[PDB]
Design a protein around this nucleic acid. Sequence first.
RNA 1: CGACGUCGCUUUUUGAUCCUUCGAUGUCGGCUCUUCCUAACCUAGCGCCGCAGAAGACGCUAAGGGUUGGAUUGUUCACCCACUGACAGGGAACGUGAGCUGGGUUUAGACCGUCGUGAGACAGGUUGGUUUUACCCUACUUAGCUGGAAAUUGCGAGAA
RNA 2: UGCAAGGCCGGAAAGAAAAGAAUUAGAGGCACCAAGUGGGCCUUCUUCGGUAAGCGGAGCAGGCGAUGCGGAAUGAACCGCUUAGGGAUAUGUGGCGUCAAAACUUAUGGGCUCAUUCUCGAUACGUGAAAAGGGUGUUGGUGGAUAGACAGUCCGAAUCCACCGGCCCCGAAAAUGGAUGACGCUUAAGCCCAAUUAGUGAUUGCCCAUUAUUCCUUUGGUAAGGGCGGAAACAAAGGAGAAAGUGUAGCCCUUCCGAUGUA
RNA 3: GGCCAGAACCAGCCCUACUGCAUUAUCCUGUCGGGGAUCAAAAUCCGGCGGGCAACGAAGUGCAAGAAUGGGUCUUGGUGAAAUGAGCGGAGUAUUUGAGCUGCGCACGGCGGCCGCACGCACUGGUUUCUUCUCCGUGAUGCUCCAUGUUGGCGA
Lengths: 186, 158, 178
Amino acid sequence: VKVKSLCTLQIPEGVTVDVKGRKVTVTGKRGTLTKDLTHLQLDLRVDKKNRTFTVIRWFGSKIPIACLNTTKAHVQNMITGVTKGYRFKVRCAYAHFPINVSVDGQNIEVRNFLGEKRVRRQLVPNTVKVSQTDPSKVKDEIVFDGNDLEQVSREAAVLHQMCLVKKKDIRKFLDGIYVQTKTNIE
Amino acid sequence: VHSYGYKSGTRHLFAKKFRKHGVPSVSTILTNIKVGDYVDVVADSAVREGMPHKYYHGRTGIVWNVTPRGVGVIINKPVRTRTLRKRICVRFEHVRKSRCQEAFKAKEHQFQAYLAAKKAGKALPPLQKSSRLGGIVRPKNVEVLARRVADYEAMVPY
Amino acid sequence: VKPHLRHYQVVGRESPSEKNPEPTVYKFEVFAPNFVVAKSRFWRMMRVKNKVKATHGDVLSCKVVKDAKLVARNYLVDIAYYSQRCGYTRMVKEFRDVSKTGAVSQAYHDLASRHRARYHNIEVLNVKSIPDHEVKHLSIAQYHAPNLSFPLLQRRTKATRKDRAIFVKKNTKRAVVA
RNA sequence: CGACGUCGCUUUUUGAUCCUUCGAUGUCGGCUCUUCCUAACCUAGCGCCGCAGAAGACGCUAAGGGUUGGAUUGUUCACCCACUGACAGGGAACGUGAGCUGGGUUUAGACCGUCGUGAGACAGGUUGGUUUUACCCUACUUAGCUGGAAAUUGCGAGAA
RNA sequence: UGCAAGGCCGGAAAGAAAAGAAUUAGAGGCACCAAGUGGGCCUUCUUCGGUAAGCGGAGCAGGCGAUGCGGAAUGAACCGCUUAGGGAUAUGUGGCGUCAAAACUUAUGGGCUCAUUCUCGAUACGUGAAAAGGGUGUUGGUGGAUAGACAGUCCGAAUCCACCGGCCCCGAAAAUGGAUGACGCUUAAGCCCAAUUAGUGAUUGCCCAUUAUUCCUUUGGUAAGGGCGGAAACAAAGGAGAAAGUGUAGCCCUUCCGAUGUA
RNA sequence: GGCCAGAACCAGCCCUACUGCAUUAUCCUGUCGGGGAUCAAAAUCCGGCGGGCAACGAAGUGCAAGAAUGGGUCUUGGUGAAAUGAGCGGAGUAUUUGAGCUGCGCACGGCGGCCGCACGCACUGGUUUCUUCUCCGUGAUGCUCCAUGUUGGCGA
Ligand SMILES: [K+]
Ligand SMILES: [K+]
Ligand SMILES: [K+]
Ligand SMILES: [K+]
Ligand SMILES: [Mg+2]
Ligand SMILES: [Mg+2]
Ligand SMILES: [Mg+2]
Ligand SMILES: [Mg+2]
Ligand SMILES: [Mg+2]
Ligand SMILES: [Mg+2]
Ligand SMILES: [Mg+2]
Ligand SMILES: [Mg+2]
Ligand SMILES: [Mg+2]
Ligand SMILES: [Mg+2]
Ligand SMILES: [Mg+2]
Ligand SMILES: [Mg+2]
Ligand SMILES: [Mg+2]
Ligand SMILES: [Mg+2]
Ligand SMILES: [Mg+2]
Ligand SMILES: [Mg+2]
Ligand SMILES: [Mg+2]
Ligand SMILES: [Mg+2]
Ligand SMILES: [Mg+2]
Ligand SMILES: [Mg+2]
Ligand SMILES: [Mg+2]
Ligand SMILES: [Mg+2]
Ligand SMILES: [Mg+2]
Ligand SMILES: [Mg+2]
Ligand SMILES: [Mg+2]
Ligand SMILES: [Mg+2]
Ligand SMILES: [Mg+2]
Ligand SMILES: [Mg+2]
Ligand SMILES: [Mg+2]
Ligand SMILES: [Mg+2]
């Protein structure tokens, strides 16, 4: 086993990172985020004066060490989402039947997917803001905005998986809703 | 064996050794066998007359009878819970003088010679000393006993 | 805990005979739980290298080579073991320990755990204390850091055997059954 | 999809054996009824294809549910006709005879062919040929009476 | 006068030396009269026929049969030990999380392992369940290499290839609900090594036998011995016995050894 | 009291505490050189040379023989109806075990007659500097068995 494995993260000036019992709270200009990491058993340390975040594993084999960079990646995603946000833009791709998408508040209704009469409905959680781009700018573009990368990507994924083609060749029939661009709000 | 004839299962027992074939030599003819002598009963494969049964091959017994061409030998044979003194009749070619009492006879002669020397006042031969005793060991060359990598590299063929 | 193997030096030879009046004297170092096992390993080695049986040999001395003063050291143990599937497998392993006997006992435990090798299928070819800069594995070299520090996390601390209790108050040291 | 090879698995075949039963464990098939298995026929979800669609091939999780009407044959099997989403494969003393039935096998009557001098024989064909008993104990189905926390006592004292 | 054979008379006899130079719970022989039995089975190792078999057939030797007791949860045969009626103390095999006695879950011992519907493993005999093949799960080893290297778009430290192990996983489908014996166990209560209160100051942790040692009692010997010529004295208001004996409540005492068992 | 308990002591037996003798060298320790790492160092490591006892409870190394002159016996009998006693009596301040030191010859080791002898054997050698119990003692005129304390409780 290795005595000491260490990962360090730098923190931007605006961000505030606090750890207490493997629970990380990240505060930026556009909100706050929380992460429950009590399943990890790592030594999380924040240096406020030097604005560094450190995660340490003591006496670890390969499996515990693999969690260090996972923790650093989660905290970095929280910092980025609390200072810039996440914006996932999905596109409706169809051959013949135009996929009709309605965004009334937090509810997404998908109609006419491959000409079907069934209505696919998604209730986006309140931490993710879903909008629909004007068709004159980009046709069939739905945008997800949020501070949490995991929540935004999960919403885009559940929208993608509501429109899977069943009982047809998948190489053909490329109809679906696919995330195209993953960028930041600011 | 599948049959129980007189010479069953003697293919290797009653065969001559490699490059040692031939009839018994003149030294066998000229050997004097007495009644009471210890003899070895070893069948000569090339004679085939007066041949012992396979059981008595390699047995040592005492001569009880001498005939013009045969020897009477008493052999111990275990049968069930007792040993029988079997009297077998073989030709002299299948008999050898037994050295089974050679060491005892030498011991007796050495004891008689020792007594004669002790009577004559001659100095007896020095008594041999035990090799099991202790003592100082002065090693002329001392080597290290160890296992080397080369031993493993050698014990692997090809 | 003190090592379960001792460092023995067995000195022996073939018994002098008329054919071999002054036999060669061999010095053999072995790690064994007692001196009877040490003599057994010595006579096995004499049999397999010099064709000298114990029935025709002498053991001049079977002494324990004392350990040095306990100092944190890097020990290089060149060791081999036999398995039916692989034959003889030789390996060179580095250990942190305070003595040669401790290092070899640790090597035997390591072979028993990581390769299921038992004592009589194992031959220690050599054990040497090496400097820090000759250590190649990072699992040992990490103990050469001058500022080597670590906390004691996930401790399982049991009370003194007399003080141990079956039932104790939840946020208190008062024993209810003890 | 796999030739030459090679490693398994399963007792839904048949053999091999002879452990149990010969003061007897009723010994074909069907009928009826329940349940179990999964090596999945249909039904639920899917992956993959020489996957355009339709129809399909292969594979995974899954045995919850379903898996038929008939002609011939004692049949198990077989075959054909017809419906169906489908007409999957098996076990339970080769489930099940004090549950039935008795067409077959396998007594005594009789006929034929072949065999035998003959009496008779033939795992060859044919026809006719007693299917006994529960009121006991359990199990199961319902149907009643009735004490009991020290599971009958201690007074032995614990409240979701 | 040599040889062979029966004797007779003498001699010498470590009574068998020294060189590792035997040991013995070593009375050797000889009969007579009879019983059961003459179906055998299992096992280590060797072995033949058979694809194999809890199949058939042999060799050496141990068992069961005829035999319990203590262990392997359970089993004629495996392990230990084999047995008069009882204590005490120690063990054997096997164990010490509970069932269940023992680590009230021992150590101030080291490593390894995560196993989702027959549910990872803990199954000596017992094959009384698993293989060929495979795994970028993890932990070891053996060779080779490349070192501002590999990757990434340059830029700061180790990276790559082949092969072989340990444990785990896939391979791995059957019929009543079910079996490491059950529950559970994962800072193991699993696996492989070690130990006995722990680098402190020496070499016996603990529990369990119809075994060992020891004590008491019984019984029988191929039993071994002592005493038995009443020593002397002694009323009531120290006592009694003392048999020359196979066997009895055994003359009496002491002392050793053995005690299971179908036909 | 031929019942139930407690304690005391005696003999036997069963457990425990109390430890000496050998050994250590691949060891201990200074110094010089190398090498290592540092921020500089020391260390880990390798050689030479000089001294040695790692001696605190030195070692977890080989053998131990240390007179319980502390527990248990509801695991045995007893209360002196024979006490055999290093233990109970009597009498003496001694006996002689070992450990130190040491004489002669031999033995052993080295060099090949000397030089060494760790202290081996014979003189059952010397010295008592430390350590120690040393002698005597009771037949059965008992063939055998059984019959003998203390303190309470319960029994009038
Ligand atoms: K029958
Ligand atoms: K189903
Ligand atoms: K039937
Ligand atoms: K130096
Ligand atoms: Mg299609
Ligand atoms: Mg032959
Ligand atoms: Mg021959
Ligand atoms: Mg009947
Ligand atoms: Mg019946
Ligand atoms: Mg399936
Ligand atoms: Mg199908
Ligand atoms: Mg389907
Ligand atoms: Mg029908
Ligand atoms: Mg069947
Ligand atoms: Mg049936
Ligand atoms: Mg029935
Ligand atoms: Mg009936
Ligand atoms: Mg009929
Ligand atoms: Mg005719
Ligand atoms: Mg008929
Ligand atoms: Mg008829
Ligand atoms: Mg002799
Ligand atoms: Mg018979
Ligand atoms: Mg058999
Ligand atoms: Mg019998
Ligand atoms: Mg068992
Ligand atoms: Mg037995
Ligand atoms: Mg207990
Ligand atoms: Mg078992
Ligand atoms: Mg096995
Ligand atoms: Mg494999
Ligand atoms: Mg279980
Ligand atoms: Mg068990
Ligand atoms: Mg006195």
